[PDB]
Amino acid sequence: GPLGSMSQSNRELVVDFLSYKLSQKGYSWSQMAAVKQALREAGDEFELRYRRAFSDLTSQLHITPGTAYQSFEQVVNELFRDGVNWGRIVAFFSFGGALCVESVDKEMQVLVSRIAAWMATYLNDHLEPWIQENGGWDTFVELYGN
Amino acid sequence: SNRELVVDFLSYKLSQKGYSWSQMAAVKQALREAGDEFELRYRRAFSDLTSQLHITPGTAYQSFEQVVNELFRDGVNWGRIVAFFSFGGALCVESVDKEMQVLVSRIAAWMATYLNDHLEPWIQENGGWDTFVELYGNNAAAES
Ligand SMILES: NCc1ccc(OCCCc2sc(-c3ccc4c(c3)/C(=N/Nc3nc5ccccc5s3)CCC4)nc2C(=O)O)cc1
Numbered sequence: 001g002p003l004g005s006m007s008q009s010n011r012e013l014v015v016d017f018l019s020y021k022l023s024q025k026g027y028s029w030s031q032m033a034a035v036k037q038a039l040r041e042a043g044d045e046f047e048l049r050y051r052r053a054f055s056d057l058t059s060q061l062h063i064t065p066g067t068a069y070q071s072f073e074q075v076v077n078e079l080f081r082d083g084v085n086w087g088r089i090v091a092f093f094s095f096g097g098a099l100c101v102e103s104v105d106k107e108m109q110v111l112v113s114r115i116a117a118w119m120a121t122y123l124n125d126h127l128e129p130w131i132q133e134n135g136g137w138d139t140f141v142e143l144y145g146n
Numbered sequence: 147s148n149r150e151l152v153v154d155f156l157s158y159k160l161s162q163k164g165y166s167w168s169q170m171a172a173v174k175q176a177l178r179e180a181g182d183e184f185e186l187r188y189r190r191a192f193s194d195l196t197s198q199l200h201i202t203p204g205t206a207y208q209s210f211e212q213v214v215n216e217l218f219r220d221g222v223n224w225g226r227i228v229a230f231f232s233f234g235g236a237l238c239v240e241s242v243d244k245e246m247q248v249l250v251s252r253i254a255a256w257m258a259t260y261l262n263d264h265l266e267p268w269i270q271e272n273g274g275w276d277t278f279v280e281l282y283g284n285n286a287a288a289e290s
């Protein structure tokens with residue numbers, strides 16, 4: 001690959017492994033690593049226990065390569081029609097993940113990077129103000145971590 | 147920062163369902179699994195390399211390199227590369243136990259240097275990290 005490829009990919013590998021090993025002993029590579037792990041765990045639990053009791057939002061979107069942010073935003077808003085809470089933000093991440101998997105399942109690989117940018121924009125415009133006034137991601141970790 | 151959370155979660159989720167956000171996605175997961183296996187099954191059978199390093203704030207790369215060399219004294223193989231990562235992880239946990247969290251980024255830098263200098267040329271000739279995945283990744287499905 002390109003000149004720095006090995007440098008980036010080795011660093012990615014080292015940080016991932018060290019983050020994992022520290023996490024297993026109740027520590028963390030960084031505060032951001034603690035947030036990521038808590039979100040991974042919360043998303044898994046949402047999918048295991050709570051998701052099937054709600055209507056399937058992926059059915060509402062019916063994503064295609066012609067799909068733009070505006071459609072994604074309108075569907076995601078349904079999650080927060082009764083307001084923001086941490087569980088609903090968790091469902092939001094899980095939704096994004098399910099869309100990505102579905103897109104690959106259906107040979108629409110182009111959507112994965114698209115969805116990633118959709119989510120970042122939705123977070124910044126719609127969820128960050130609530131996050132900052134509700135203790136930040138550090139509070140999420142205290143409530144959802146382990 | 148919100149982007150960093152998005153990227154991590156999507157990548158974790160995709161790998162869970164068999165897909166790769168980036169080239170290292172399947173490698174990270176196989177390495178995590180291989181490391182757990184090594185620690186559970188193997189580690190107790192070798193001499194503890196962390197005892198030889200006795201890491202302190204004064205420890206530099208040279209000391210780390212001299213100790214890790216013992217792992218590869220009979221050559222490189224994937225098993226020893228797994229042990230190498232496990233070793234790095236153990237030094238990091240040990241550093242935090244001893245309230246020396248500052249050492250963690252230094253150990254990570256040491257690992258990247260050793261990996262590039264001493265391990266990567268072997269990895270590149272032995273089919274890259276995808277080969278590690280082929281051999282050490284979960285192949286229970288293919289076996290079925
Ligand atoms: N102890 C660890 C833990 C982890 C996760 C937990 O989640 C609890 C449920 C979170 C939600 S989700 C929610 C909500 C509100 C409105 C709507 C929804 C959900 C809807 N969800 N539909 C979805 N369909 C999909 C499809 C794929 C992936 C995610 C989703 S979410 C459709 C209708 C609109 N409302 C809430 C809530 O608690 O208020 C709890 C505990």
Ligand SMILES: NCc1ccc(OCCCc2sc(-c3ccc4c(c3)/C(=N/Nc3nc5ccccc5s3)CCC4)nc2C(=O)O)cc1
Nearest residue numbers: 180183184192193194195196216217225226229232233236
């Ligand atoms: N199915 C998935 C899977 C995953 C891992 C596997 O590993 C097999 C053993 C790996 C090693 S380790 C090894 C070796 C060779 C020379 C030495 C050592 C190990 C030594 N290890 N000492 C260590 N002390 C520590 C302390 C903490 C963490 C890691 C270590 S490793 C010290 C003496 C010199 N030589 C080998 C080898 O296979 O040749 C196999 C299968």
